[PDB]
Design a protein around this ligand. Structure first.
Ligand SMILES: [Mg+2]
Ligand SMILES: [Mg+2]
Ligand SMILES: [Zn+2]
Ligand SMILES: [Zn+2]
Ligand SMILES: [Zn+2]
Ligand SMILES: [Zn+2]
Ligand SMILES: [Zn+2]
Ligand SMILES: [Zn+2]
Lengths: 879, 879
């Protein structure tokens, strides 16, 4: 699975700003990177100093209720530009390093300005921090902290863009400032100039710790008129390595080379590529690549420039829309994507406003795709996990707005919170949009409802991911994919529906569970101490509480979920009067991708002692339902279904002798009660509804003194194939095999014609020969929630599929477009005494069995037929 | 149909404000109310004057591209409070009337302040308008313009809340200011005091023109410590009518009576009720009602107070969270809902923050329900149509934020735009959420895509609503409900699918069409001059343009919709290589209510000359598809379907002799090609997919020189019952009938037992007697898109339905919960020579026919049976 991008929940951090320029993820403490604060500000003007605002992260404090980011002004400065942070005082709190006194533009550089200073973090939320001067250089414009020549002091690389008003040709000093031993006294730091460069517009840092032992010290990557280059100190001296020269010079235009550059990790190499925007404020996005089998890192490789995109011509002043690039692992796959900060344009163009996310889609040819992730001005991007402890990467932006120069409407700071789940209000219910679990690399958890002693939580798990739980207490109900856990009785697996008429505990007996190869989506039932405890003697004891986290929309946070007597619902139509029978709604789970497909609808129910929810059969709306009992009032509450024909049972005055009872104890889920074919496909009524016998939840019988409510959850799935009737014996371990027909004397093996991945490619049996092209390998996997198997070509992934229609002598082909419910590409498996395997299609209620077969006893066409068992016995040989 | 509320698209008008208090819909011109500007401001502080900001409506200018509201400061004032507007200079531009110099609170009233002034609108967008003093009174706090004692000058009623610092017991003058003959000279207006009141906190105006001739002049409704009362001038004198006294006085608490009041239209009466918040800044919502058969209006009725809601206790200072009530017809049904402005609370409570919308649900008992429409602070609400010309009502709010008193986080101005359609990005496609057409009272239109010479537009129509079109040019394709138009050949009706294998023009030959009783949802194809003209000779000529209006989210506005060669789509899997066959995606239409149900998926396609889109049968995903051709390349392009068994046709090398061709000319749609039962229910495959014969779009044959593309739209619907095979004769006009069995000599008529609306109530035939309880009436209606009818009880709406299962001798009952696709409650109709009518259920492929019947030849049970024609012949008698 290539990784898909996560979703993003937008949130306005600060709107209505007079201007904007810089945004920075600022961790308040130097021992923690998670939920940092945001600092933002603009360039100011001659009429207004710029407030250096630290916006306090409301999510940082565990158990938070607020989504409001409180601004705390650290300073009020004339013409600030760039900033970074480091623990200067070495006391566990990050200090701010900032440049100011720049002037109002490149044509108005303060000759005595270009100051670099630091702001002492006082270890608590207070405004107006103590500020001390580090040094000065006119035009001072970018800076980063790090360890460049030593590791026992903070050091700062600082670089002016120009040296003087309107001077676009004189190079500027690249300066390293070194903290003194006591930075709270002294004043003016040690300074050393380590190079001169033209129009440097970005400084990027590669921390030594990123380089897996290649570098003792941090590398400085500069993007300016000279192109992109890397400076580093190696214990002995400074060296330089040219990455490339960027945009060629154009006559009458003072900007060439690069405007920004960032270093992109691919797998094991922190520098698998280097991306760049060109030139100063330009419209060109390029990437630098090195040849296959290069050393890791930057300085040992030869780089080559490739232009990816030109977003349009420059204006009269030779500028465009791109302000910055940054690299970050947005989709969690171990490769950095890169983000491009698009300021906006005049005339307005959405293509040049917001953030583009570029993704390396082919490591071999170094091909990238791009996806728009925001369409409001970004003059700068900050990345961090702003909302949780996980390895997700959120994106913060600030609009680019400089009054009387280039102003964006409504300048604002925004944050886009990476998530596998977005919540939105319908009317009385919530739509929960989820990523496909198979292609996400992040765990997402969202608590939604505190009810009946549990915090019901929606949980998206990537493939083979772990979820820690409270052993013997936490419960799970899977809605897509699979999870499993192990205990002394071996492996336990859970899927959307257990076996027909079956019952399974939802309780996890282990300390953790893991998703299988497709990931999982599930409801996790955490224990709660804030929604009552059983026995529930009244609906008052069962009041439910909205648990949505503070970053979900306000309209969802404000929702209540009352229990409503079923008599009072708009669908009662005069029924259920005077019954202790209650309903709580409700939650749709749909895929967030372009299918928008339903996953499940979820609602809750209760029934007092002696109460029946009423016999029904779902002729009104089609779905496959599973119930999970949270609390069983008497121990005897559960599902009954009629075992007689529909015509022979009266749901209004039920004869309970013509029913069977499946008791559903506390924290158990029951299996399907709908009608199925022998291989698990659902029977269907003439109006396209899943066919059910008459059935109902009924509480244990007796007198409600004292009262004790059943509480249960309905999961309404779209139609799917479930398990088989009767259950077949297990005879085949999934794995990778050659699939052979014939005697020890001369075999043919199953083959996809020419290994061709094209839909419709014939499947054949190739004579195995000494000349000896060897057998094609097939992956055989169990289809979860069924007793069926699929056969997928190991090289191309093509599924073994009968062509339509599945009839005697029908041809077999490879496909990635199977029929729904895998009708012609799923197989019932049996083993004879010779230990050969037969694969049989789902049997049409019409016809006889049809087996995967050879067409005769150099290539033999492969077919389905059920006349001859001889032609459909295969040997499986591990490959 | 009760009316449902519309959806609301939120938009931030202005964020990051220092404070907030007032928001007002401000029409710039006095001859137009649509798309007004917004004025907002807060109380200011001693440290900052308050900017009186007029935020320019970007949607006001037809052909707009921007969603940005430009602020224009009209004035900068010390401590402004209330404002309104009127055409003072009588020149066609509204002037602003404003109070200021109030002071900083009720404990700090400026003794020489309480100024009332007006700002002269200069007829263009300029800041800082000329300001002139009208008059003064300390504590001045609310004001409205109108015509109170004359109609030839602007008049202003102005009322202080207190007269002096901390004085909560002295009553204040109720003052009327009258414009001079030349308001641009003179200065200080004529003033008359027309009453004194305690703690007036709201002034509401009933315009004379609203009163259908009851009042010559405007009525002034005041809400204060004295309760709610109405003052008016009648040509002769001022009078007063008490509405009620509001919240009783409580010991130690200075606030009682009312904080706000608004007058609510119900149908023909501009004052069917009066709503109120109590007391000053309180938490109590009450309504005033008058008895059935009262005169219309206010002063002739006796009113009675009813408390609806108390949102919680007051704080230490005796205040709560409600600042204002307003009445407006939010759902367009001719009755005013009311809105309640909830400022917020400390500690925070979502229940007391935002806007609640109260709806009168029972005119008889005057019962209201409430629905949360915003959950961010509203210190004031303005209503208007901010986005179009229609009678929709949008809501603008400003947060209540007074520094050092009660401050809301991120004070902002927001607007909630009333709509039947919300658009949201999925990934490459757009989700269009729509209201149910049956319960909306608004037309909504949203352009989405400019392609192939048409502006494709999504259109929601309420029941019996009109849509003007360009005769013989505009095209429509219905996705839900029905529309029709008339021309010289009579009525034409369109529904989601015409007859199986049929073809109909989409072109409207009339100047308008109308929706039927369920409303409609449709795609309107407007003519375009900005997306090319046929013949389309290349895909370049077919570039499509995003048309979403400026108020939809930026992420949807920024989307492009490229044509992609089908070979290049991720679902091709190696197919369609080197074909001129292209695909454009795409648009989901789903219901916005708690069902979230699919309506249709929409995508587009093209095929060059001689190109086949390939034979297929939809075993992969289930849906009922209809295609509409926009442009037919050769005139011969269209749908072929195989007329032989699935097993007998090779989609890879098709024999076109075993197919039939339906040519689909320009702007035509074809009918269903899927397999159906005789009464229109879809055949279903074992994997729950709609069963289709092999079928494909194929372009006209020949050589692409010169090229000419087919362009067509796919509409993928969920499963539904279509028309019958063969089509039955039309023998019954829908309408209201008594349904009788038997001889002229002695009949029984169809009856719902005891007229009982309960699901499952028996249907019977009651002996018609001289003693003479007369026959129950039934509404018989055609089911659109089918040849079936339904029978609904005229009093209760209950559908005539066979109980499950429909078998010989099965009982018949009334229901509001029919089986999907109306399986047991829809009827095929035939007429014998005696002119009697027989009603037959959809026939199960199993059983024989089953007719609505009497069970014998005082009440006879009614059943379904098909053994005896005798028992199932009915006379229909108009009722
Ligand atoms: Mg420190
Ligand atoms: Mg005027
Ligand atoms: Zn810049
Ligand atoms: Zn990545
Ligand atoms: Zn059920
Ligand atoms: Zn107030
Ligand atoms: Zn209304
Ligand atoms: Zn088709």
């Amino acid at each position: 699975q290539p990784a898909a991008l996560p979703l993003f929940q937008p949130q306005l951090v600060q709107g209505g700003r007079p201007d904007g320029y810089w945004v920075e993820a600022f961790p308040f403490r130097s021992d923690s990177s998670k939920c940092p604060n945001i600092i933002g500000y603009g360039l100011g003007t001659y009429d207004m100093k710029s407030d250096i605002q630290m916006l306090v992260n409301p999510y940082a404090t565990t158990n938070n209720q607020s989504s409001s980011w409180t601004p705390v002004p650290l300073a009020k400065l004339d013409f600030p530009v760039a900033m970074h942070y480091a623990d200067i005082t070495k006391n566990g709190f990050n200090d701010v390093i900032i440049t100011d006194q720049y002037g109002s533009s490149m044509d108005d550089i303060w000759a005595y300005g270009g100051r670099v200073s630091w702001l002492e973090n006082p270890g608590e939320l207070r405004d107006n921090w103590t500020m001390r001067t580090i040094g000065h250089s006119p035009g001072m414009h970018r800076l980063k902290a790090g360890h460049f020549t030593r590791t026992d002091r903070v050091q700062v690389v600082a670089v002016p863009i120009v040296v003087a008003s309107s001077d676009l040709t004189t190079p500027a000093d690249v300066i390293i400032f070194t903290a003194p031993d006591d930075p709270r006294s002294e004043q003016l730091w040690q300074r050393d100039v380590v190079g001169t460069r033209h129009l440097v517009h970005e400084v990027a840092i590669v921390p030594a710790a990123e380089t897996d032992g290649e570098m003792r010290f941090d590398q400085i990557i500069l993007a300016g008129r000279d192109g992109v280059d890397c400076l580093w100190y190696d214990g002995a001296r400074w060296q330089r390595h040219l990455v490339g020269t960027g945009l060629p010079e154009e006559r009458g235009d003072p900007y060439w080379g690069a405007g920004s550059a960032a270093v992109g990790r691919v797998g094991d190499d922190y520098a698998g590529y280097i991306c760049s925007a060109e030139a100063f404020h330009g419209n060109t996005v390029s990437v630098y690549t090195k040849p296959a089998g290069s050393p890791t890192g930057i300085v040992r490789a030869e780089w080559t420039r490739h232009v990816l995109d030109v977003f349009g011509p420059l204006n009269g002043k030779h500028t465009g829309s791109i302000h910055q690039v940054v690299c970050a692992d947005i989709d969690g796959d171990g490769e950095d994507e890169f983000l491009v900060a698009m300021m906006g344009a005049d005339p307005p163009d959405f293509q040049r406003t917001g953030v583009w996310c570029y993704k390396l889609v082919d490591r071999t040819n170094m091909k990238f795709s791009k996806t728009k992730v925001s369409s409001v001005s970004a003059g700068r991007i900050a990345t961090a996990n702003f909302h949780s402890q996980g390895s997700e990467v959120d994106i913060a932006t600030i609009s680019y707005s400089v009054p009387g120069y280039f102003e964006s409407p409504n300048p604002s700071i925004n944050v886009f919170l990476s998530t596998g789940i977005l919540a939105e209000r319908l009317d009385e219910e919530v739509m929960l949009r989820v990523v496909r679990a198979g292609s996400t690399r992040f765990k997402t958890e969202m608590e939604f409802l505190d009810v009946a002693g549990k915090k019901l939580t929606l949980v998206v798990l990537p493939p083979f991911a772990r979820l820690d739980v409270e052993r013997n207490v936490s419960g799970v109900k899977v809605m897509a994919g699979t999870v499993c856990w192990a205990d002394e009785n071996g492996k336990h697996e859970r899927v959307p529906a257990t076996r027909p008429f079956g019952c399974e505990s939802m309780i996890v007996s282990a300390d953790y569970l893991e998703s299988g190869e497709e990931g999982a989506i599930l409801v996790l039932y955490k224990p709660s101490s804030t929604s009552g405890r059983p026995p529930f003697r009244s609906m008052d004891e069962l009041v439910a509480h909205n648990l949505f986290p503070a970053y979900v929309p306000d309209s969802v946070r404000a929702m209540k979920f009352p229990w409503v007597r079923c008599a009072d619902r708009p669908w009662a139509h005069g029924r259920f009067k005077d019954l202790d029978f209650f309903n709580l709604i409700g939650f749709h789970v749909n895929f967030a991708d372009d299918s928008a497909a339903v996953l499940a609808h979820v609602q809750l129910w209760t029934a007092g002692i002696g109460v029946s929810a009423g016999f029904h059969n779902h002729v009104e709306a089609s779905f496959c339902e599973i119930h999970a009992c949270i609390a069983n009032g008497t121990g005897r509450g559960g599902m009954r279904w009629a075992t007689v024909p529909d015509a022979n049972f009266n749901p209004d005055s039920p004869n309970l002798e013509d029913t069977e009872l499946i008791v559903v104890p506390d924290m158990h889920e029951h299996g399907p009660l709908w009608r199925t074919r022998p291989d698990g496909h659902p029977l269907l009524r003439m109006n396209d509804t899943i066919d059910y016998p008459w059935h109902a939840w009924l509480a244990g019988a007796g007198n409600p003194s004292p009262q004790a409510f059943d509480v249960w959850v309905a999961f309404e799935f779209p139609g799917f194939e479930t398990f088989s009737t009767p259950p077949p014996p297990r005879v085949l371990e999934p794995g990778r095999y050659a699939i052979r027909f014939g005697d020890p004397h001369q075999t043919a093996s199953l083959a996809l014609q020419k290994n061709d991945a094209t839909d419709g490619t014939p499947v054949l049996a190739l004579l195995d020969l000494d000349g000896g092209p060897s057998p094609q390998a097939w992956n055989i996997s169990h289809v979860p929630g069924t007793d069926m198997y699929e056969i997928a070509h190991a090289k191309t992934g093509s599924l073994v599929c009968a062509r339509w229609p599945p009839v005697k002598n029908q041809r077999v082909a490879g496909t990635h477009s199977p029929a729904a419910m895998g009708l012609t590409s799923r197989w019932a498996v049996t083993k004879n005494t010779k230990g050969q395997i037969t694969f049989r299609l789902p049997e049409a209620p019409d016809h006889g069995p049809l087996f995967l077969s050879v067409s005769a006893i150099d290539a033999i066409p492969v077919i389905v037929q059920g006349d001859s068992i001889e032609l459909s016995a295969w040997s499986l040989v591990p490959a």
